[PDB]
Amino acid sequence: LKQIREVWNTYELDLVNYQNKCRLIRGWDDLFNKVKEHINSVSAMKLSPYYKVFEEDALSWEDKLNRIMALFDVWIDVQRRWVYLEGIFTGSADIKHLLPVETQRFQSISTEFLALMKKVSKSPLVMDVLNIQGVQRSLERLADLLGKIQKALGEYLERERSSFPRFYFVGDEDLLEIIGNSKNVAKLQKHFKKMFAGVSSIILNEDNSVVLGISSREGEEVMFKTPVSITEHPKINEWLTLVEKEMRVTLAKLLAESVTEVEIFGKATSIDPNTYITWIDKYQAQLVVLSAQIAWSENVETALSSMGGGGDAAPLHSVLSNVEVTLNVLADSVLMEQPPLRRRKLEHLITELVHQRDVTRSLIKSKIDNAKSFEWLSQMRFYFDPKQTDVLQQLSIQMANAKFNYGFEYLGVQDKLVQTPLTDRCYLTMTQALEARLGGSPFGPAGTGKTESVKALGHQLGRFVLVFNCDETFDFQAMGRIFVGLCQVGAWGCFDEFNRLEERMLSAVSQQVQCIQEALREHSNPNYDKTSAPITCELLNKQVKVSPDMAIFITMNLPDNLKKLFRSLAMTKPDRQLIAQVMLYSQGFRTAEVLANKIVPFFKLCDEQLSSQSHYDFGLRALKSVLVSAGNVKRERIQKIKREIAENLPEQEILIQSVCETMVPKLVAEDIPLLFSLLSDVFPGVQYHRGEMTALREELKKVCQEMYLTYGDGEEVGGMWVEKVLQLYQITQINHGLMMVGPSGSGKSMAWRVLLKALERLEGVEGVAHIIDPKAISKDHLYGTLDPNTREWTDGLFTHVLRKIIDSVRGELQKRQWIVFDGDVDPEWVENLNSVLDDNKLLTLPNGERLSLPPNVRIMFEVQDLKYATLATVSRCGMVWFSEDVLSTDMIFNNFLARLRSIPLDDSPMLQIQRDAATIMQPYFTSNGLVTKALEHAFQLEHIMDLTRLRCLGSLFSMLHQACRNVAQYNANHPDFPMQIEQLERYIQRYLVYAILWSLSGDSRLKMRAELGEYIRRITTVPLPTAPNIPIIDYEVSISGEWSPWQAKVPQIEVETHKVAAPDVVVPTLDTVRHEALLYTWLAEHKPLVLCGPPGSGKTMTLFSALRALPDMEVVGLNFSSATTPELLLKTFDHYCEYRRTPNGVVLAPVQLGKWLVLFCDEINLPDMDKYGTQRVISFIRQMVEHGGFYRTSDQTWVKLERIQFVGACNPPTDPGRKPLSHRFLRHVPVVYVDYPGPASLTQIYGTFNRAMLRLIPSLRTYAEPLTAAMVEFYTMSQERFTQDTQPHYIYSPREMTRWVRGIFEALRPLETLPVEGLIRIWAHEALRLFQDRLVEDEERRWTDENIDTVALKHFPNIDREKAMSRPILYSNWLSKDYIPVDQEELRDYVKARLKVFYEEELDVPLVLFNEVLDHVLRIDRIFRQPQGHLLLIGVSGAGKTTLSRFVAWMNGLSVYQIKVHRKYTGEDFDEDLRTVLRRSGCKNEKIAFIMDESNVLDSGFLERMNTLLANGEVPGLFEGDEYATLMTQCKEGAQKEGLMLDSHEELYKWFTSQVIRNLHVVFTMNPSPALFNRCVLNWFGDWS
Amino acid sequence: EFIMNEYKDRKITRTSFLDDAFRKNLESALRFGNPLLVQDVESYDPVLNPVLNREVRRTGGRVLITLGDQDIDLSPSFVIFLSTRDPTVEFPPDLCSRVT
Amino acid sequence: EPPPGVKANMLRTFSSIPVSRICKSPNERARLYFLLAWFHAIIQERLRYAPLGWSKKYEFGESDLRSACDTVDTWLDDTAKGRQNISPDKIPWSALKTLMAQSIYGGRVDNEFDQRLLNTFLERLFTTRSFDSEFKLACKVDGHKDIQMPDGIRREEFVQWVELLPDTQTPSWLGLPNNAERVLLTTQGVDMISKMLKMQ
């Protein structure tokens, strides 16, 4: 209760400012979770019988805690309600007229709430305001009043919505803004889109007081016959109802006038095109098609009535001839240039006249004379009667036996569907279902025309049709009110695909639809045909009236609830041939039937012959788009030929040109020859010609010349790349939002950068791009956040960029802006961009502000494979595929050579030396004789990671750059006699071979390096190294220009005796110095790299000592766990780096001036891939490496990295938890395969340590070499057998030899005058305890014993016939003062006695000491004696691992600490426990035994924490801020208690790490990760024998 | 139900690992000294291992058990019954060894 | 389970429809309902022989029969406003054929070939030649025998004719070959072997 009582005297309310300059409370989490924890703690302690410490304080504190809980639980709701209603009552205008009683009530409530807020602001202590009387009662009263007023607001909003039924289509906040912003009518003008069918804006007076008429999105405009004025109808609902009524009336009158006028055209023949065009322009497209329909239906009906007697002069032939002449006039008219609206009206007229022509021509010419015949009755017939006064009754549409009316609702202009026979039967079935009061349920494969056919039927009848898309676009909270609106306005509903809904949503919506349908069918009861009481169903707990005009349609791809209420039609196979024929005919194409007959099977073949990719779309939508593009191309060629009728252009060439111009960019490299072969098949002897675009090509050539890139034209080098750039330009022109997709290693970024430069130079418009990586940044930070309390809007990165572009500051339209999204696409963030990519071009923030991007902006994506993208995002934007064949290898070589010849490495002598080097290496790169052959050979070999051409070439280029730098330094050291040309040639050739060796197949095993060397030997004539029995990889190119072995440069070191096998001591060896030189090579070019290899192969130490080896490097050790996120790197920058804005832009640099920061990343591949296959931190590092910076979230500003570089190390991807790195990131970082050190390398690096420790005793100094040879050979023998396949824990690494040397040194540390048999016996004992106890079978153990004896005999034969000293080979420290060897019996007796006292004083269950228990006790004792002795107890559960560990820990005095684990055990609790044990181990000197079980590991993060704690000795990412300061203070105190001078944190932390090295042994008990298998001594604690 | 009817005189309380109040129910039952029946042993809760292991510390006339941080007096006759409803399950050896 | 057989299905359909709905209007409406019931039975017991018959197991059910009966009612009332015995030629045969081929029963059909089979049934049954006394509902039934057409003016004659149907329903009743039963029996035997096999 002490900690609970002290923490409640320090909490603060954490007041924050509000937009109304008020105070609010933040931190509900800290203010509720800790309170609940205190409640749990006090309840537990008062529950536990150990309550005789505090009795009344607990109860008083508990009632206080309940007071806090109640107060703040009411307070959070009151605050949320007040902020929401304050926004509603202040932002919205006209509230004084909109229910002023609630306005005054809210004013009083807000006054009381603000008085309470002032009271809290004066006293910001938590308990200070609790002690104030009346706070709870006033707060509860405020809650009740807020609930009542919110209920009143909801009831008023529902009443207003019921007043005007179309308000049911918009949400609560939109309706609030509509009813509040009455004066600002422009706010309603954006909401007009949702409520109505076609009108998007209403036309007002000059003073905005009279509604003159309506309009649409396209531009079509309708003048009201009698305009309505808002003056005498001030209420929004009243004058919107008047607008709707006047819109119905105006459409009725205009249709009557149009019908009367078209009777004149339809009287006979000889129609004048001029007056026909004037008639078309006069009336709306809806009314134009209606007039044509009415005229044709009436004319055919009169012709049939006259034909009723018989062959009465055939007026029906005259009707057909009139249709023919009208259609010919229309076909002639579309050839001439027309306005887009007139063009759309004319195409609608053509398609409808084609349907009318076909009906009479085919179905009616087969001897039909009766007007009541079904063959005429089946067709949709239009009967217009302007006599009737009612607006909605004048026009009647009758299909078969059904009799609908025409809801005179303006639809703007909507694309019509050609009446295919499938569409005809769809109309028939759906009308039959509607007549029988049954909804229609068409089904079939997606994209066949179900939703479009239903919508077309609804628009033919004039009903407003709602389409509810299924995938991730359902809002069930709005579905009910949308249904109520459909019922009360007589609209239609068409679910796009009903089966995509999951079970709960489908069930709820199906129940609602069932209720709707039973209500609808009740209108047609045989005994209740006359509806006296209107039919009402039950939605939202209210009786909503059902209008007979209402309809519901669902499309399958069917629930048991709706089987008996819905009729189904199969639309599996649409008629593509007739659709193509009619659309081509309506586009002015002659012989359109042949073109359709050819194009439809072609699109069928492309779905069959070509490959299958997600971005491919050869459905009907794509076919229609190709057709309209072909029409545009034909009209363009007609216009071009005019300026130099003309019905002789080849149509097939136009069609294939449109097909290729639209579809070739999406094709992969393999699919282009297939597409052209298919074109030669379907369209034989017809050629496709590319647009020349010579004006852009010249600028492209100039930009490529100045950008060091390769330009081509067609077949030569660069032709495919420049063609892809031109396709990118055409896609940019045609639409916005395009995405560039292709394998990493293609010229995507170069393509769009070069095209932007070419556009700037050619058109003169300045082009600046905004490259955004969306995966690195959080989506909530990408778009923006609304705080739950303040509800203040902080725009995100993309939102900030868009707002800056839109706001009138700089370059709104005089500059083209390209928002390039570099990274990987997935639903998570493209959900918002979906509304921007489509034709809406609108970005709806959750704040409610709508942002529409200007025309100049293009939203570009560059991705690699496009496999986690929704089809919605892919279809909403065009794309070009950048195949890997596009970026050829020779052009990469040309770019590298040009860049080397042009750009100085030290940004004239350097330029001259680079140009000489390039002249020397020209016959290798460009010629396809050495580097290409070596590249393909390396590709057909195996590497540790996937081989990416760009990575393998970039490492080579950087190494050649380092070669040039080496030559420059050689010249610098010798001014006289500089690098001569012959020496230069020799050096550059040999270094080029060496760099091919280390870059190509430089991340593979030694055997594959040897294979590459042998292949190079076969395919080059350069001077190879002389010795044929030594691999070329061992040799080095000296500055003199001759092959010198790397071994000759390996030095000898004499490490001090007290630093043997120390934490950080690297002894030089072949691999170490060679990797160090290569690492320096890639370090100079600031090029990030990753060292990959098996566990404990010397990756961390080699890189780490190399990094402190340079004087200008300041190293940062970061550990990448699975849960590693970019905020780790942000924190590292925040602590070791500073932000400066004094340059042209913000720049991030380390605080230490003149120091190059390096952020070493431990286990760079460890961070886990998200559910879309991307690693956030890896993408963030890729963004930093490639573009040299990132975006701050605080102010959304690009910051450039200065003096910052990354390096990593990792285990191979095949190991558990090792996710392969992305190829885009991989091409930037070269990798080196750090394999296990060879026999010779181990021999050297461990003979160093043997000599170092044996110098302690002069007598044994002669024995170091045989000892090292014995250790190395036994380790090799134990490595060839006992591999990972037999047992997963049979892993052998040079870290076990380190433990061997350290254990022998520890044994010999206090001992002196040791004979040779003593050294051999301690050697054999450590061999047993490191290589034999890990074994699982007795045969393996006896084999280990025999080979230990064998190697001990072979490496030194002068030892007594005793094996080591005897068979058992035992060691103990209890019997003596030193670690003296012991025998069996007295050791057994001592252990028995001490175990007896152990379980008589600490345990309650007796233990027996059998032989296995004694051996395991000895092993754990040996481990506890050795600092950083970590044990791996593998064996069956309940076999005594924990008990024996605690027994030996008590026997050695080690304090035992283990994790008290539960189900809700979390990461921060485990880190706090690790902090506690580290404090007790480093500070307050105390030996600790850390017993952790397999069940104690719940998350992989715990395992990573253990991995970083065991080998390294500390956890760098464990101590942050306050805790860091506290442990620094404690380490200072403990050091002065040990009388040591550290002072500097760097050194005091080093001492803490050393103390933890000495005072922490972790024992892991596991029932039967390779990284965890190392750095722990394995003890096979088998089952009881 | 056999276990309930057998231990009704001792007021046996029925609970499950899925219940959020399992720890509180465990503490109350262990303090008062009455039987507990924990069904849904599929999601075994590691906090019960000290109870199953019977790690008991007779120190200073205070028999106590290490449940998290606050150790609670282990009242006598505290029998906990673990139960499940399915017959196909592979229990971890940690739990399999500690129970009959 | 519904009892397999054309007679059982026709009896069930006749019992489902009220006699008032079948006996009003012109006296032919009873024969139109009889033809509709026979067509429904033929297309619904052919559904048992899924491979040889309806290529896919469609869902012709009670709702389709109700919709077809409603279509017959509406079109016969519209054609014959009075209550006299409408002439056989004046029956809207084309209207019923088209509405049953495209809507109602044709809504379920997916491929063109079962649609063609449905059209074959509709033109063979729903026609004016069905009025003649010697109209064959199914020809070559067991070779020599041929199912005739009951001459009735009211429900009772048709119901009695249904009850006097022979017990032996060979598959030639539905137009399928007489050995279609052999294939169905072989399939059921293989199914029983498979079901026994899975019980190990």
Ligand SMILES: Nc1ncnc2c1ncn2[C@@H]1O[C@H](COP(=O)(O)OP(=O)(O)OP(=O)(O)O)[C@@H](O)[C@H]1O
């Ligand atoms: N003529 C050339 N056109 C384009 N790139 C070239 C050309 N010659 C050489 N290159 C090199 O090829 C590479 C093209 O990759 P680019 O940077 O354009 O792609 P990215 O979008 O950044 O990444 P990735 O393609 O791996 O997804 C660059 O390293 C560039 O220097």
Ligand SMILES: Nc1ncnc2c1ncn2[C@@H]1O[C@H](COP(=O)(O)OP(=O)(O)OP(=O)(O)O)[C@@H](O)[C@H]1O
């Ligand atoms: N050249 C060398 N000089 C000295 N010690 C070496 C050398 N090569 C390997 N070792 C020893 O091998 C072990 C490798 O240490 P380290 O933990 O840094 O390896 P690693 O390969 O980075 O491991 P991991 O994969 O676990 O991160 C140490 O015990 C080290 O002393």
Ligand SMILES: Nc1ncnc2c1ncn2[C@@H]1O[C@H](COP(=O)(O)OP(=O)(O)O)[C@@H](O)[C@H]1O
């Ligand atoms: N009969 C038709 N005439 C003209 N276009 C059609 C026809 N049927 C389908 N389409 C076209 O197919 C495209 C997609 O149809 P859609 O409504 O998505 O079908 P589904 O209901 O299977 O999703 C639309 O652009 C539409 O124009």
Ligand SMILES: Nc1ncnc2c1ncn2[C@@H]1O[C@H](COP(=O)(O)OP(=O)(O)O)[C@@H](O)[C@H]1O
């Ligand atoms: N050698 C032994 N002789 C007698 N009892 C033993 C022995 N080893 C273990 N036990 C018993 O096992 C119980 C707990 O085993 P534990 O140490 O948890 O095994 P594990 O560590 O494998 O889970 C103790 O009560 C102890 O009495």
